[PDB]
Structure formats: structure tokens, C-alpha cells
Amino acid sequence: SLFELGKMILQETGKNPAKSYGAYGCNCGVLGRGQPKDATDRCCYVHKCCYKKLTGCDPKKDRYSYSWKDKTIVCGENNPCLKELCECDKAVAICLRENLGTYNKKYRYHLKPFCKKADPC
Amino acid sequence: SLFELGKMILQETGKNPAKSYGAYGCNCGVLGRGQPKDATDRCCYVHKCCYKKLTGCDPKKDRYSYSWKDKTIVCGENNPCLKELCECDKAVAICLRENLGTYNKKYRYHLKPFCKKADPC
Ligand SMILES: O=C(O)/C=C/c1ccc(O)cc1
């Protein structure tokens, strides 16, 4: 759920997840996808395309088990859809930390309705 | 549109609109309505109910004219829908400012999917 996803982002980046990524660019946080504004945004683009391959679990609300082991996100047992979901979330947290170097606060509270339409996944 | 709405909120409250109200509680900013968390939140509840009659225009994207005269929001002429849209936005900016006394940051980046369902408008 948003709880695990947020903890993952905090653990990787060291940043307040909701504040830094809750409404970043055309793709991070609420709502769907748009043409990515930069690398950070594109992380969330991939992230939401990852969600489209899931098989019925709720990416926003379904809790799952994972652990922070040797400073690594390790997706726990769960069921297959939750496992894939946890992997989607792990991938975007890692990607957001990797791209901290081009993080732009001007995209932080982006007016997503004016975003250009995204290509299909 | 969001440009006018954001400027009204900034002028009345003195606060960064996107940051303080873009995701506040169950009702302010992105997405729809939910059971209000407080008075600030309930402003945005009334706000979005005010929007439900505006089926003739787009509250997020349609621009309109208004001026800031004598520290007052004055809606410009416009057509019936845009005028009403302007008055919705003026009323929430005022309400948000009037309720600054109980603004709570714990609701600033509220996880809206876990919000309880709202009463019908
Ligand atoms: O970074 C933040 O979350 C908030 C900064 C902030 C700035 C002015 C305020 O009145 C409240 C919070």
C-alpha cells in the first residue's frame, strides 16, 4: 500500500516521501501518467506502468510484508500479486534515490492536469 | 482554473497554495471528496460540492478573470459557468483563510484513499 511505498522511499532517499514525491511531475503520486518532466518523474512513469501488469490487488491500499535488511528492500512472502506489487514499489524507491541528483523542487507540487498525455505502457 | 484558484488562496491565506492545500485532508486539492478532517478540510468539501453544478465548464482547466482590489477578490464578468466557478473559488479561498487558526500540518499530505466516504452533496 501507500504505507509500504512511502516507507521504502523514505528508507532509500532519506526524504519525506509525501512531501517530495506525493505530487512530483506528471507521474509521481496521485493521478495517472503524463509525459515525464525529468528522470525522477520517469521513475514514477515506469512505476505506474508496473502497476498495470498486476492481477487484482490494490496498489494504494493492500498492505504487504517486506524488510529493510542490510539497507536493502527485500520483498517478503505474500501472495503472487502482492509480491509483484512490492517489487514495483521497490523499483521506484531505488530509482528515486538514484536520481536525487537531478531532483527539481519546481516540479514538487506540479499541476498535473496540464501535463501532456503519456504514451501507452 | 487551478491558476486562478491557487492565486486566490495565496492572496487570502498568505500560504503556498499547492503545498498547504494541494493534498490537505480528505477534500482539499487532488481527487474528490471525503469525510472532512477539520474546518480547513470542510471548506474544500463545500468547494467541490459547489463545483458539481458547473457541468458547463472545467474547474481545473478553464481560465477566468478576477482582480485583487482593496484586499478583496472581485470576480470579473465572464459567462454563467465561469462566473459561478470564480465564486466557488473565491468562497473557498476566504474559508481557508478564515480557518487558518486550526490548520493542522498532519493533514497536509493526507493519504486520501483511506478517507471515509463523504455525504452526498
Ligand atoms: O517542508 C515542509 O513540510 C513545510 C514547511 C512549512 C513552511 C511554512 C509553514 O507555515 C509550514 C510549513
Q: CATH number for the domain including B104?
A: 1.20.90.10
Q: What is the spatial distance between Cα B51 and Cα B81, in angstroms, rounded to a whole number?
A: 10
Hey, what's the cell of A72? 536493502
* Contact status, residue B65 vs residue B76, Cβ threshold 8 Å: yes
Q: Which of B82, B81, B13 lies closest to B44, judged by CA?
A: B13
Candidates B3, B24, B109, partner chain A, best to mutate (most A CBs within 10 A): B109
Q: Is residue A8 within 8 Å of residue B119, measured between CB atoms?
A: no
Nearest to A28 by CA among A119, A101, A89: A89
| Cβ contact B22–A109 (<8 Å) | yes
Specify the amino acid at residue A51.
Y
| Partner-chain residue, chosen from A22, A61, A113, that has the shortest CB–CB distance to B23 | A22
Our measurement of the distance from residue B5's CA atom to the centroid of its chain's CA atoms, rounded to an integer in Å, reads 7
A2-13 helix and A80-98 helix, angle to the nearest 10 degrees:
30
How far is residue A36's CA from residue B97's CA, in Å, rounded to a whole number? 34
CA triplet B41, A27, A66: central angle to 5 degrees? 85
* A111 Cβ under 8 Å from any chain B Cβ: yes
Among the listed residues A41, A62, A89, A110, the single catalytic one is A89
Q: Amino acid identity of A49? A: C
Structure obtained using = X-ray
- The C-alpha cell at A64 is 504487504
**Cα Dmax for chain B:** 41
Known catalytic membership, residue A47: yes
B13 membership: H or E segment, kind and range: helix B2-13
Domain count, chain A: 1
Grid cell at residue B95: 474559508
Within 10 angstroms of residue A4's Cβ, the number of other Cβ atoms is: 21
- Using left for φ > 0, alpha for ψ between -120 and 50, and beta otherwise, residue B4 falls in alpha
d(CA A9, CA A16): 8
Any idea what DSSP says for residue A112?
G
User: By the CB < 8 Å criterion, does A56 face chain B?
Assistant: no
- Please check whether residue B78 is in contact with residue B64, taking contact to mean a CB–CB distance below 8 angstroms: yes
B interface mutation test: which of A24, A109, A112, A116 has the most B CBs within 10 A?
A109
Full domain range(s) for residue A51: 1-121
